[PDB]
Enzyme design. Structure first.
Site, PDB file in Angstrom:
ATOM      1  N   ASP A   2     -34.296  61.243  82.576  1.00 20.97           N
ATOM      2  CA  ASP A   2     -34.428  60.906  83.970  1.00 20.97           C
ATOM      3  C   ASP A   2     -35.622  59.960  84.100  1.00 20.97           C
ATOM      4  O   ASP A   2     -36.436  59.918  83.207  1.00 20.97           O
ATOM      5  CB  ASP A   2     -34.605  62.185  84.783  1.00 20.97           C
ATOM      6  CG  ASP A   2     -34.308  62.003  86.258  1.00 20.97           C
ATOM      7  OD1 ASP A   2     -35.156  61.388  86.954  1.00 20.97           O
ATOM      8  OD2 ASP A   2     -33.276  62.539  86.735  1.00 20.97           O
ATOM      9  N   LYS A  28     -19.502  52.485  94.458  1.00 22.28           N
ATOM     10  CA  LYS A  28     -18.659  53.430  93.721  1.00 22.28           C
ATOM     11  C   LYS A  28     -17.254  52.966  93.469  1.00 22.28           C
ATOM     12  O   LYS A  28     -16.694  53.197  92.361  1.00 22.28           O
ATOM     13  CB  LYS A  28     -18.683  54.849  94.329  1.00 22.28           C
ATOM     14  CG  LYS A  28     -20.037  55.475  94.205  1.00 22.28           C
ATOM     15  CD  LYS A  28     -20.336  55.862  92.751  1.00 22.28           C
ATOM     16  CE  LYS A  28     -21.570  56.720  92.665  1.00 22.28           C
ATOM     17  NZ  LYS A  28     -21.890  57.268  91.267  1.00 22.28           N
ATOM     18  N   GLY A  85     -30.141  60.538  84.505  1.00 19.35           N
ATOM     19  CA  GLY A  85     -30.357  61.041  85.844  1.00 19.35           C
ATOM     20  C   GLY A  85     -30.250  62.594  85.954  1.00 19.35           C
ATOM     21  O   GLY A  85     -29.704  63.117  86.893  1.00 19.35           O
ATOM     22  N   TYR A 117     -23.256  52.530  99.360  1.00 12.20           N
ATOM     23  CA  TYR A 117     -23.016  53.481  98.263  1.00 12.20           C
ATOM     24  C   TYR A 117     -21.546  53.533  97.935  1.00 12.20           C
ATOM     25  O   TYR A 117     -21.136  53.418  96.757  1.00 12.20           O
ATOM     26  CB  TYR A 117     -23.448  54.857  98.714  1.00 12.20           C
ATOM     27  CG  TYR A 117     -23.045  56.057  97.894  1.00 12.20           C
ATOM     28  CD1 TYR A 117     -23.409  56.188  96.584  1.00 12.20           C
ATOM     29  CD2 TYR A 117     -22.410  57.131  98.544  1.00 12.20           C
ATOM     30  CE1 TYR A 117     -23.125  57.386  95.891  1.00 12.20           C
ATOM     31  CE2 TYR A 117     -22.090  58.282  97.892  1.00 12.20           C
ATOM     32  CZ  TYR A 117     -22.485  58.441  96.576  1.00 12.20           C
ATOM     33  OH  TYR A 117     -22.256  59.626  95.964  1.00 12.20           O
ATOM     34  N   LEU A 142     -32.328  65.226  86.261  1.00  9.77           N
ATOM     35  CA  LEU A 142     -33.168  66.195  86.997  1.00  9.77           C
ATOM     36  C   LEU A 142     -32.755  66.448  88.426  1.00  9.77           C
ATOM     37  O   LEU A 142     -33.345  67.293  89.097  1.00  9.77           O
ATOM     38  CB  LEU A 142     -34.638  65.754  87.000  1.00  9.77           C
ATOM     39  CG  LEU A 142     -35.274  65.606  85.624  1.00  9.77           C
ATOM     40  CD1 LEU A 142     -36.709  65.227  85.912  1.00  9.77           C
ATOM     41  CD2 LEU A 142     -35.221  66.801  84.714  1.00  9.77           C
ATOM     42  N   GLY A 143     -31.699  65.780  88.889  1.00 10.68           N
ATOM     43  CA  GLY A 143     -31.228  65.932  90.263  1.00 10.68           C
ATOM     44  C   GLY A 143     -30.393  67.176  90.486  1.00 10.68           C
ATOM     45  O   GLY A 143     -30.256  68.045  89.613  1.00 10.68           O
ATOM     46  N   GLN A 144     -29.684  67.174  91.610  1.00  7.14           N
ATOM     47  CA  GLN A 144     -28.810  68.306  91.947  1.00  7.14           C
ATOM     48  C   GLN A 144     -27.743  68.636  90.898  1.00  7.14           C
ATOM     49  O   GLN A 144     -27.631  69.798  90.505  1.00  7.14           O
ATOM     50  CB  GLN A 144     -28.121  68.101  93.309  1.00  7.14           C
ATOM     51  CG  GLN A 144     -27.504  69.400  93.819  1.00  7.14           C
ATOM     52  CD  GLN A 144     -26.589  69.191  95.009  1.00  7.14           C
ATOM     53  OE1 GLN A 144     -26.409  68.100  95.565  1.00  7.14           O
ATOM     54  NE2 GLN A 144     -25.961  70.273  95.370  1.00  7.14           N
ATOM     55  N   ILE A 164     -21.065  68.715  97.002  1.00  9.84           N
ATOM     56  CA  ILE A 164     -21.380  69.797  96.044  1.00  9.84           C
ATOM     57  C   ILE A 164     -22.462  70.724  96.609  1.00  9.84           C
ATOM     58  O   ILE A 164     -23.502  70.252  97.068  1.00  9.84           O
ATOM     59  CB  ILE A 164     -21.758  69.256  94.649  1.00  9.84           C
ATOM     60  CG1 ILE A 164     -20.691  68.272  94.129  1.00  9.84           C
ATOM     61  CG2 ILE A 164     -21.935  70.395  93.652  1.00  9.84           C
ATOM     62  CD1 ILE A 164     -19.274  68.745  94.213  1.00  9.84           C
TER      63      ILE A 164
HETATM   64  N1  LIG Z   1     -24.426  65.952  94.921  1.00 14.38           N
HETATM   65  C1  LIG Z   1     -23.221  65.713  95.412  1.00 14.38           C
HETATM   66  O1  LIG Z   1     -22.773  66.407  96.366  1.00 14.38           O
HETATM   67  C2  LIG Z   1     -22.415  64.540  94.926  1.00 14.38           C
HETATM   68  C3  LIG Z   1     -21.163  64.202  95.494  1.00 14.38           C
HETATM   69  C4  LIG Z   1     -20.449  63.112  95.005  1.00 14.38           C
HETATM   70  C5  LIG Z   1     -20.930  62.334  93.961  1.00 14.38           C
HETATM   71  N2  LIG Z   1     -22.174  62.667  93.443  1.00 14.38           N
HETATM   72  C6  LIG Z   1     -22.644  61.802  92.348  1.00 14.38           C
HETATM   73  O2  LIG Z   1     -23.241  62.615  91.280  1.00 14.38           O
HETATM   74  C7  LIG Z   1     -24.314  61.856  90.694  1.00 14.38           C
HETATM   75  C8  LIG Z   1     -25.597  62.749  90.769  1.00 14.38           C
HETATM   76  O3  LIG Z   1     -25.865  63.085  92.123  1.00 14.38           O
HETATM   77  P1  LIG Z   1     -27.005  64.118  92.466  1.00 14.38           P
HETATM   78  O4  LIG Z   1     -26.565  64.800  93.727  1.00 14.38           O
HETATM   79  O5  LIG Z   1     -27.394  64.851  91.215  1.00 14.38           O
HETATM   80  O6  LIG Z   1     -28.139  63.106  92.836  1.00 14.38           O
HETATM   81  P2  LIG Z   1     -29.738  63.367  92.934  1.00 14.38           P
HETATM   82  O7  LIG Z   1     -30.243  62.380  93.874  1.00 14.38           O
HETATM   83  O8  LIG Z   1     -29.954  64.817  93.202  1.00 14.38           O
HETATM   84  O9  LIG Z   1     -30.257  63.053  91.502  1.00 14.38           O
HETATM   85  C9  LIG Z   1     -30.424  61.712  91.033  1.00 14.38           C
HETATM   86  C10 LIG Z   1     -31.211  61.694  89.768  1.00 14.38           C
HETATM   87  O10 LIG Z   1     -31.192  60.339  89.280  1.00 14.38           O
HETATM   88  C11 LIG Z   1     -32.506  59.908  88.958  1.00 14.38           C
HETATM   89  N3  LIG Z   1     -32.701  58.444  88.914  1.00 14.38           N
HETATM   90  C12 LIG Z   1     -32.796  57.585  89.963  1.00 14.38           C
HETATM   91  N4  LIG Z   1     -33.049  56.347  89.474  1.00 14.38           N
HETATM   92  C13 LIG Z   1     -32.972  56.429  88.123  1.00 14.38           C
HETATM   93  C14 LIG Z   1     -33.082  55.534  87.100  1.00 14.38           C
HETATM   94  N5  LIG Z   1     -33.372  54.253  87.367  1.00 14.38           N
HETATM   95  N6  LIG Z   1     -32.941  55.917  85.806  1.00 14.38           N
HETATM   96  C15 LIG Z   1     -32.736  57.216  85.513  1.00 14.38           C
HETATM   97  N7  LIG Z   1     -32.639  58.121  86.491  1.00 14.38           N
HETATM   98  C16 LIG Z   1     -32.732  57.746  87.779  1.00 14.38           C
HETATM   99  C17 LIG Z   1     -33.383  60.680  89.975  1.00 14.38           C
HETATM  100  O11 LIG Z   1     -34.845  60.783  89.567  1.00 14.38           O
HETATM  101  C18 LIG Z   1     -32.684  61.989  90.197  1.00 14.38           C
HETATM  102  O12 LIG Z   1     -33.198  63.051  89.395  1.00 14.38           O
HETATM  103  C19 LIG Z   1     -24.418  60.535  91.429  1.00 14.38           C
HETATM  104  O13 LIG Z   1     -23.650  59.492  90.795  1.00 14.38           O
HETATM  105  C20 LIG Z   1     -23.759  60.822  92.828  1.00 14.38           C
HETATM  106  O14 LIG Z   1     -23.167  59.628  93.384  1.00 14.38           O
HETATM  107  C21 LIG Z   1     -22.895  63.766  93.888  1.00 14.38           C
END
Ligand SMILES: NC(=O)c1ccc[n+]([C@@H]2O[C@H](COP(=O)([O-])OP(=O)(O)OC[C@H]3O[C@@H](n4cnc5c(N)ncnc54)[C@H](O)[C@@H]3O)[C@@H](O)[C@H]2O)c1
Ligand SMILES: NC(=O)c1ccc[n+]([C@@H]2O[C@H](COP(=O)([O-])OP(=O)(O)OC[C@H]3O[C@@H](n4cnc5c(N)ncnc54)[C@H](O)[C@@H]3O)[C@@H](O)[C@H]2O)c1
Ligand SMILES: [Cl-]
Ligand SMILES: [Cl-]
Ligand code: NA
Ligand code: NA
Lengths: 320, 320
Positions: B34, B147, B8, B143, B10-12, B173
């Site tokens: 990803d 978790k 995963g 969600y 490519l996300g944030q 974040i």
């Molecule tokens: N961003 C925050 O503020 C925050 C806060 C608490 C927890 N988190 C946790 O951090 C983790 C990442 O969050 P984020 O903000 O980067 O999320 P995001 O939504 O920005 O990124 C999610 C990434 O997962 C990929 N994805 C979705 N389905 C997939 C699959 N089947 N196989 C492979 N990849 C897949 C997406 O294409 C995407 O690039 C998550 O577990 C989220 O619960 C984030």
């Protein structure tokens, strides 16, 4: 008056519950289903209103619910503690996926839905003495982990969709029909059988390990009574309930009182012990008593009297 | 030193984490993956060791792991709070099944596995002021429910199989690299974009709803530090970590101090508000600080300075 669907209905709780529901609301108002069919000596053999359904087949599960139009559902299938540690994938599949399917059907078809939880949902941070309804949940078995998820997911379905999800955390349940096996609380039935056969009992739970327990007739009363309660009276979706707590040494003293002879028991730890030790000693069930009138009519000696009479009748062991 | 797989990625979180791991350990020791391919302007586009992997494809996931032989994995895919309430089947599939597959791979192939939890694991019974690591968990979103299951299931893998499962409960974040989406804490990131574009920010979280938050560089430091820690230093598998708390009112003032001008914000409650209101106002992260040295360099005004300088540069918004 309800139309009741029971899934995983041929096991320990489901068999006795199915009969009780049929008695109370009539056979035409009850549909009993399980992935297996009843043995020719099973109590539900040859009865109408008994069907075969694998709850992992969501399409089949829906087909059955459309046809029968239940207003209530008791969803019972689960892989429990000892088996779940040996077969965790099967526990995760059954305990998570069948539950997800059940709850989706309860939403779609407006069904009041009961899914039992368990004292196995607690672990060693719970407060082991008179454990509260809300506390830290840190289960030590995959079964227990899956039942925390059951509780939280069912409660979410209530909050999000108005699904009338109801649950109790069941203690160890004792009944006379059960074949002694390797389950977490099966020491108790093994002990009753040993006493009747006048054979040495080798007990896998340590002698002074206390657990919350309940005798089946009390369990069945509560399982009906919670589902009858008006929604407005329920302050929570998941309730502790207990019958009485006992350890193996206490069960032995009970049996000896009711047989007026000694039974030979040797305590040799088996797999059940580490699991039972991570569970509470006793539960606080005041919320259940107050909101919907959970009550208990058997104590350990009443239970022992009934067991020692029922087992010979059911299984052909020598009587007292 | 380690061979690190990110899923995963490519996300944030993944975008900035992947770049930090490549810098620290070398590009040839990091593989990131990803379900989608990076677009031509993604920070990870054009880079070696970036692959397409659907973590719901268990055979594909295995194949990749068996080929790369990671010693660490960061398993990041999930559907988060606001989107999960609207798409709960997708959230349950991704959040439960991908995790199940990742943990099994960690067991089979001896990987130190990080799977982030979240403040969304808590609900309205958690003790919302300086929430402890061990408390009542009653999340109000699917969600959050998934978790809690993640935490308990990872912890059970550590206990049963000795898998080195580590986690933190991340706050909201904040970062500049990624364009903001429709998620709960992403109101903050939108408010920086609106300020720089000098147009109305319509904010769906109420102006005094305080939440735990953290700026990305501190998040990156801690995500690496917890994975570098010797196992014997960790007294628990899941840790709260926080940066600082703020409300939307507080952020707006911080932005206005830096921009030396009013910004226009209107508060029109959306789904994010009732979700945010069920989360802590602040966390106790003492166990993380004590055990493995979680530390925080940024406060709200240092964050706002950096965000307002970086966003124009990375995305071409109007400077300063
Ligand atoms: N961003 C925050 O503020 C925050 C806060 C608490 C927890 N988190 C946790 O951090 C983790 C990442 O969050 P984020 O903000 O980067 O999320 P995001 O939504 O920005 O990124 C999610 C990434 O997962 C990929 N994805 C979705 N389905 C997939 C699959 N089947 N196989 C492979 N990849 C897949 C997406 O294409 C995407 O690039 C998550 O577990 C989220 O619960 C984030
Ligand atoms: N018996 C106890 O002491 C006790 C205690 C606490 C909680 N519980 C809970 O009560 C419920 C029933 O327990 P039990 O003791 O009757 O269990 P059991 O093992 O005696 O019965 C389970 C039944 O589920 C059926 N089943 C399994 N997979 C199925 C599937 N795929 N589709 C449909 N049916 C399936 C099995 O064939 C079996 O008849 C379970 O959720 C259990 O966790 C029982
Ligand atoms: Cl068991
Ligand atoms: Cl969100
Ligand atoms: Na079992
Ligand atoms: Na979201």
């Amino acid at each position: 008056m309800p139309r009741v669907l029971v899934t995983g209905a041929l096991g320990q709780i489901g068999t006795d519950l199915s009969l009780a529901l049929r008695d109370k609301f009539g056979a035409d108002s009850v549909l009993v289903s399980d992935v297996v069919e009843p043995g020719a000596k099973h109590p539900l053999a040859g009865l109408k209103g008994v069907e075969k359904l694998d709850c992992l087949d969501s399409n089949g599960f829906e087909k059955l619910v459309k046809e029968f139009k239940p207003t209530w559902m008791y969803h019972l299938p689960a892989i429990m503690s000892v088996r779940g540690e040996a077969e965790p994938d099967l526990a995760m599949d059954i305990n998570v996926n069948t539950t997800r399917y059940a709850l989706e059907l309860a939403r779609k078809y407006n069904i009041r839905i009961f899914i039992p939880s368990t004292i196995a949902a607690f672990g060693d941070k719970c407060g082991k003495t008179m454990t509260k309804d809300d506390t830290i949940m840190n289960p030590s078995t995959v079964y227990g982990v899956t039942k925390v998820y059951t509780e939280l997911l069912g409660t979410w379905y209530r909050q999000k969709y108005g699904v009338d999800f109801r649950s109790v955390r069941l203690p160890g349940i004792i009944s006379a029909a059960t074949l002694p096996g390797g389950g977490a609380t099966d020491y108790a039935i093994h002990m009753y059988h040993s006493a009747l056969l006048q054979k040495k009992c080798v007990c896998p739970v340590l002698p002074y390990e206390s657990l919350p327990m309940m005798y089946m007739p009390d369990t069945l009363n509560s399982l009906v009574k919670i589902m009858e309660a008006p929604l407005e009276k329920l302050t929570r979706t998941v309730y502790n309930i207990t019958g009485f707590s006992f350890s193996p040494s206490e069960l032995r003293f009970s049996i000896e009182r009711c047989t007026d002879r000694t039974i030979e028991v040797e305590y040799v730890e088996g797999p059940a012990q580490k699991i039972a030790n991570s569970w509470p000693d006793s539960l606080d069930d005041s919320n259940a008593r107050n909101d919907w009138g959970h009550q208990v009519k058997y104590d350990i000696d009443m239970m022992s009297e009934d067991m020692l009479r029922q087992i010979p009748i059911l299984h052909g062991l020598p009587s007292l």
